[PDB]
Design a protein around this ligand. Sequence first.
Ligand SMILES: Nc1ncnc2c1ncn2[C@@H]1O[C@H](COP(=O)(O)OP(=O)(O)OP(O)(O)=S)[C@@H](O)[C@H]1O
Ligand SMILES: Nc1ncnc2c1ncn2[C@@H]1O[C@H](COP(=O)(O)OP(=O)(O)OP(O)(O)=S)[C@@H](O)[C@H]1O
Ligand SMILES: Nc1ncnc2c1ncn2[C@@H]1O[C@H](COP(=O)(O)OP(=O)(O)OP(O)(O)=S)[C@@H](O)[C@H]1O
Ligand SMILES: Nc1ncnc2c1ncn2[C@@H]1O[C@H](COP(=O)(O)OP(=O)(O)O)[C@@H](O)[C@H]1O
Ligand SMILES: [Mg+2]
Ligand SMILES: [Mg+2]
Ligand SMILES: [Mg+2]
Lengths: 316, 515, 322, 327, 348
Amino acid sequence: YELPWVEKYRPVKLNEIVGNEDTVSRLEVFAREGNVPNIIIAGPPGTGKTTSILCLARALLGPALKDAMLELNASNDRGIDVVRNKIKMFAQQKVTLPKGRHKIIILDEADSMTDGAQQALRRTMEIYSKTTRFALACNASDKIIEPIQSRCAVLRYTKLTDAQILTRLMNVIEKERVPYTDDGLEAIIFTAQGDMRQALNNLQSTFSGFGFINSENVFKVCDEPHPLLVKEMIQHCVNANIDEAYKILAHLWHLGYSPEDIIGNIFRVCKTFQMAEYLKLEFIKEIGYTHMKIAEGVNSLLQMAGLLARLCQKTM
Amino acid sequence: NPVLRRPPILEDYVHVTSTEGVRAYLVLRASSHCLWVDEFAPRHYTELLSDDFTNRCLLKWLKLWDLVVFGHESHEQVLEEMLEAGLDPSQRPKQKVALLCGPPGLGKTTLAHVIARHAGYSVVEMNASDDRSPEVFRTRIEAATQMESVLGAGGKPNCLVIDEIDGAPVAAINVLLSILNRKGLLMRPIICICNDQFAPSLRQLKQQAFLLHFPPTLPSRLVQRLQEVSLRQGMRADPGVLAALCEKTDNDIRACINTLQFLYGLFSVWQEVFQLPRSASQRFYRVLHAAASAGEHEKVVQGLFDNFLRLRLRDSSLGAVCVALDWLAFDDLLAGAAHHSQSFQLLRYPPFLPVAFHVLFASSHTPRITFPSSQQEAQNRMSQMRNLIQTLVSGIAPATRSRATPQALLLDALCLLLDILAPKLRPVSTQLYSTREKQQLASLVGTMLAYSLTYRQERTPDGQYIYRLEPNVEELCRFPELPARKPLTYQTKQLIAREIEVEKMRRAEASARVE
Amino acid sequence: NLPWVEKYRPQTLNDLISHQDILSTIQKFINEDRLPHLLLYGPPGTGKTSTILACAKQLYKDKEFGSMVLELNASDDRGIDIIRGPILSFASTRTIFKKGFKLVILDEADAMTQDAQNALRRVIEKFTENTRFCLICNYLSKIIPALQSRCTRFRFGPLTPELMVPRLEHVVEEEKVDISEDGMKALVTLSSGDMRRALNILQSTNMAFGKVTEETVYTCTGHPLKSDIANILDWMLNQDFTTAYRNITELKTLKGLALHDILTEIHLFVHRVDFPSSVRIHLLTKMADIEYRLSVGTNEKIQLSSLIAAFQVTRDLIVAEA
Amino acid sequence: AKPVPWVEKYRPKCVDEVAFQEEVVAVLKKSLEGADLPNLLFYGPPGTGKTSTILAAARELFGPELFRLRVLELNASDERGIQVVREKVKNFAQLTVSGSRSDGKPCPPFKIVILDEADSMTSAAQAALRRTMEKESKTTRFCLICNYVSRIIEPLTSRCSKFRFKPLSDKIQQQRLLDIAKKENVKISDEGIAYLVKVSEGDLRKAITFLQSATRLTGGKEITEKVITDIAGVIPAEKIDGVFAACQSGSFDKLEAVVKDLIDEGHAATQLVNQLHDVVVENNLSDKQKSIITEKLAEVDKCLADGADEHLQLISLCATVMQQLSQ
Amino acid sequence: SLWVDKYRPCSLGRLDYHKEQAAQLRNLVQCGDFPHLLVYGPSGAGKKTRIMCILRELYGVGVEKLRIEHQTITTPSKKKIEISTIASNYHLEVNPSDAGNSDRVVIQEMLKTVAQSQQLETNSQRDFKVVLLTEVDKLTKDAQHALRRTMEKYMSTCRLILCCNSTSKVIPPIRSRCLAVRVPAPSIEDICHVLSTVCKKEGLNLPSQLAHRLAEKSCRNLRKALLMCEACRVQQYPFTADQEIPETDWEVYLRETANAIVSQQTPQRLLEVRGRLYELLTHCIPPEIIMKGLLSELLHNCDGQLKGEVAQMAAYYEHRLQLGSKAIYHLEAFVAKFMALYKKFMED
Ligand SMILES: Nc1ncnc2c1ncn2[C@@H]1O[C@H](COP(=O)(O)OP(=O)(O)OP(O)(O)=S)[C@@H](O)[C@H]1O
Ligand SMILES: Nc1ncnc2c1ncn2[C@@H]1O[C@H](COP(=O)(O)OP(=O)(O)OP(O)(O)=S)[C@@H](O)[C@H]1O
Ligand SMILES: Nc1ncnc2c1ncn2[C@@H]1O[C@H](COP(=O)(O)OP(=O)(O)OP(O)(O)=S)[C@@H](O)[C@H]1O
Ligand SMILES: Nc1ncnc2c1ncn2[C@@H]1O[C@H](COP(=O)(O)OP(=O)(O)O)[C@@H](O)[C@H]1O
Ligand SMILES: [Mg+2]
Ligand SMILES: [Mg+2]
Ligand SMILES: [Mg+2]
């Protein structure tokens, strides 16, 4: 009954988080000081918004965490009566708290809440701010209204640079003494894409699945289109060759890959490909157009063939 | 060579003919206790941060409401004139309810609270969509108002301050309208706050409500107030980051005070896109990471559309503007299709829209990057034009509304109508007019009675009067850069207006006589 | 009696074939008790429900199967309500009998909104040592990346014909049908690696035409033969516009073929032809334009003549190149 | 009585009244002795009588006593909602009676449900229909009726037996419409009947509705070519000759004249695409000219399917047939 | 009162143009089983004249006694939407396209409501009643699917008359069961005929040449022609052949837009013309109408070897404006491509 590595290697203090260094340092300044403002943390998944908010709440409250901290989440019902009752009478309650430490309402996945939920949120966070402070977590700030981002301090978490993902990955691997190859670990970076929980789960998964951490094992337990094949496809589309890229297309189509994953890996490889900048812009526009062809419901091999033809003709 | 006219030796082949037929074959193989927004709340009128015209106007409105609850006896001049536009015989103002609106974080709630505390009113708040049923809204709407005070020898009264009724369900605004239009009578002032002015639930409210649309705050008083906050809190006085920060948040007090409280974006991304810093793949990856970490792409793209042509472009093929327009339209197409197909896989491309601009408009010259977006003003103008044309087509009686489409009315049947309604008439009395002018006036008054428009007097700010249209239909017909036509005179307009009112009592008397 | 698809659902981890790695890893997970939450994704009809049901029947007896496995799919209403209903109520509780982890089997899991996926991924985090989820989906790309960061993903992939023949031979041995040598080739080609369509089309042409040949299954299914597409492409590259247009509209009216299948078979025929590279770029661009052009609801004859039109430009180009 | 339209009035009723569709009779005749069948899907142009064929077929499989109790007939374009797909079929399969009849004849113990015009459903509704077919594969059999193949999705067509329904192809409809004309005392010549056959590509129901409309407008007068050209949605041929005469040679002023003279007439641009395509693929133009014109006609029909403006696209289509005809 | 609608015809015999279609519709409504109608044609051709004329011929005297009703509907999201209705005691007339994304909601609910309403004294008046769907073309797909469901289920008691233009976006299977009535735009001679009639009734002596100018500048739109005639009467009663016709402000604004385009081919002039395009777009006029006006005022200037590519790019950017969601990007892309092609044209 061993715990998974996502929850086993969760940080317990605020200096173990490698996401955004200035924001983490200012959060630690507020943890040692006490008067934490209303904060909202935005960014891609896996950057560590939940562990930053949880570690801030723990380092603030301590032993009074079970009564001075309310964690409302997406798996719980968040209707109009919930923001009318649960959040309100948590914000109205009294807790014997120190001079600087304040009550915390951890509102994880605030972008999934309805409009009336945020309508009942706004007055609560403006009025009861002498006692309770809201630490919102979210993925996209567009689904949240502008007034909540106005009354909060917005903390943009970036997608993680691969170096800090490597440092945490050597920390976990040295904690487990799991053998590795280097290129397999770079394959784990490529499978992560700024999602650190995805990197940990894929490493976990892959070792339990197949011993040595080598490109073959991680690319077997994931089964995305291979970076070398799609990179050679885009390279064959660079020098105006429809046929040589079409053997790679038939290789990736007779392997049973769905067209959505094919075009997603095509765009992700085309993001970092070494070619001319205007040519990269035209390629990204055509890959986007074929991706709307896919998303509208035309998932044939001939749409991939037409994508290859358009990338070939745009290179003279 | 892939094509041979000779037949293959031992493989499969496909024939190919032409219009001539050569037949070639192909192989098939409490300092630390409260926020900085709470300790720096103005407790008196002297330290307010809003437009002085708006504060004076609301103070004068709540100073003229004191008649019936205490017993004591340009757009700006339009607002001042409807402030003093008479009084109802039951001593209420003609503007019963206020509808202050605008963007978040300026201080509408703070202004309303300190004005209510200034005008001898006990403050009482309301969130509208907090309790979203008709019945609880009805109970609070006849409990917060329509009541005296329990304390002592009267004490002080209360005025209802409804917040967040922009998102209120339509039954709540219907209950508020039915309690406003009763003629048991509404006596306490109601101060409503709405974030979106053009919400469809709020359209019937404005037609009766007082309107105080908030202008944005001037950055100079913003900078000196933020400097006062920094010197009081012991922060270092660096006004450049204060001015830039306040430019980034569109002059929102909550954002800058919360950010400077946290400290102890838009313009950086725009400056990286529109000017190279003092390999090309390095700045490509830098602007890609900057556009990925920018997050909010709607305002970024909206500001990029209002700045990409203002640069000093020397393009002799206008090719870059065409490519940037194709990129912007591609982003529009992709956002619409990702809304339609509900796919999150398409949401990784609009970060490549500003990056593309850095490949196209990497002007070395120091760019005049303008923060206000004209696309937002154009959207607001289109929206208020849309409300005006629905108001106009609601004005028509069903007889003609039936004969034509509002689209056809706007495109083909309104400017020519105005041109009909602006004839050449001598400025003489109606008795001195001839018979032909009399039946022309009869035709004009019939057209106005069928269309339900009239002429209403208003005070020009020079001290004299002028006559305007009742729905003011010229702003959706005429255009600013046209050769201006001669308008009608004062005397003709006022004699036509008395003919309008005379025909109105005329038709009222005949409808009473028939029934 | 029943159709052959429901009569031979592999009940044993021995009966199923061509999924031996998924078999080995899942049995290795389930013998040592290291099974994580599973996310089984691939094409339809490659046996996603069969392997997880046989694994759940391998773990538990029939007398305890009702309290250790809960099966849901999209036949019920799915959204934010039934994730806060049966799923976490099954997941948060213990076992009525003995001890061990539980199982939730969610078929066609890509049909829920991302709010429901966020609720379910938090439910997966909250209860893990007592509940092991199994989400079966068609497309991976309809699932939020955090949910893919919880449950290990298994790709079934295509059903290769060299391990698709003997199960069809076994249902041939059990149920006597008149099937010739082209029958297996047309079954493994026409069903597109989906064995649910194989045993449905086998019953369709057994009930319909009795004997199973290439011609019987191609006439019942309405697919065009390779000779038909060879004749179509020969008319497009050989005759003039009136004659080729008349020939193909007569053939399409007589045989009842559909332009989408004609386009697919023509595309799988073009890369056999040794076209010049620019001519093949022209053909693939125009044919992808036509296949997007049918997807909105245009008139089929006009796009048919557009395909003939593109091929007329190509035949003028190849003769002009010759 | 009520005025019945002559499509469902004149449809076949029995099994052998289907006008030479004996294969559809024979497959079931085999299924009578076999007492087992998979899901069915009948695709074909309308007026053929797929619904009446399956109604008489289910009457043969169950009898008039069991027809109103074991056959549920629903129209899919009348039941496009995802709720009524996922509730009424579930309620029909949950209410089960035995497969034994009072006559003593053997009967297979599965239900019969019919979904007519299933091609008009969307992708999500057809996916929910696939789910309903998946969970009810033991106690209720599914049959569908449609006019086109690819409008039905691939998972929905992968679990059914596909049957093409051929209509009365040639030389039977003209005398049949003559019998309808003589029965209702309708005067219409031979060329009008031939034009009625020609305006509908293999569709009987279109021809009966056009004859009904023409007889309603005339009321007892002669059915000329002008009335039939008006009802059937046909641009008159002299407009196409004027378009080709303007686009053959000259200036852009005459094209604008004929395009603004074709939109003003009220003609749909898709009808111009269809008829201009018909007169390009049959004429004596060059192969390159025919190809360029027909590819642009397909592109114009694409963007008209996407809701673009007809005026500008007929301008551009006439511009490229001018650039192909003048050269 | 304006003469554009004061001298509107009432009976089918007092129509000025399309007499044969008038007789065909009169003999169609003379007998029973009046079918579902789909009336179509260009704007201003007189579709609604035929529709209230058909309503006059189908019923008795009380056909023009119209009034506005307001009906609320509920979306699946908890929000009330108030819709308008032009109605009489014999017929219904709804514009259902004003509700954008909730068009399926009104198309189900409102016609379910008027179908469940019972015709009081139904034996006296006629068998059924008629429902007008004034703007029906821009309804979405499943809204029109619910529309043909509504047409199928109440075929005995409620027939519909759908009025629109450009039926390409109207779905196929509603056109199959609806009798298609096509009203062409009246010719120059018919427009001159009705202008001469509306002047001869009102004691006017309009010359024929000015009637030809009014017809040729009305672009086959009779309401706009009568409005120009009215405005010409207001401007000057002695009518000369050389008369300045008061054109509408948006056409001459498009003419100034076009000459601002052809004056200069620089990004600063592109900024100015983008401001003019914003001023045009803010008046809630459709961008296809702006595109058509730009192409009509643009083809009077460009050379004969460049009209074809300009027309193709006009169709291309109108189509992509229809596919997109914001008009100004596609419009100013069209203007930028025209400037680039023209500066290539004069540069070489
Ligand atoms: N910056 C980080 N440093 C170290 N470990 C991290 C970091 N970010 C994430 N992790 C690990 O990833 C796990 C999941 O992190 P979370 O904070 O839950 O992700 P998240 O930010 O909440 O994104 P969501 O909730 O999936 S949208 C944690 O339990 C850590 O083990
Ligand atoms: N003069 C001032 N100086 C400093 N802070 C002020 C001043 N006036 C108000 N504030 C603070 O700034 C905020 C004022 O904005 P609010 O009125 O609360 O929000 P709002 O302007 O109504 O916009 P929304 O839509 O409600 S977010 C409050 O937190 C006040 O405490
Ligand atoms: N590897 C296999 N070996 C033998 N039979 C198989 C195999 N894969 C599929 N089948 C057969 O296919 C039938 C259908 O399998 P299912 O598991 O229901 O399909 P599926 O993978 O769930 O795809 P769905 O349900 O349409 S998303 C089974 O009853 C088996 O008879
Ligand atoms: N015979 C006629 N006599 C007088 N006016 C007519 C006649 N035919 C059409 N009209 C005028 O033409 C205009 C056409 O407008 P309308 O019927 O709304 O067409 P659309 O619906 O296409 O815009 C009407 O305003 C009508 O007054
Ligand atoms: Mg989180
Ligand atoms: Mg507010
Ligand atoms: Mg299954």
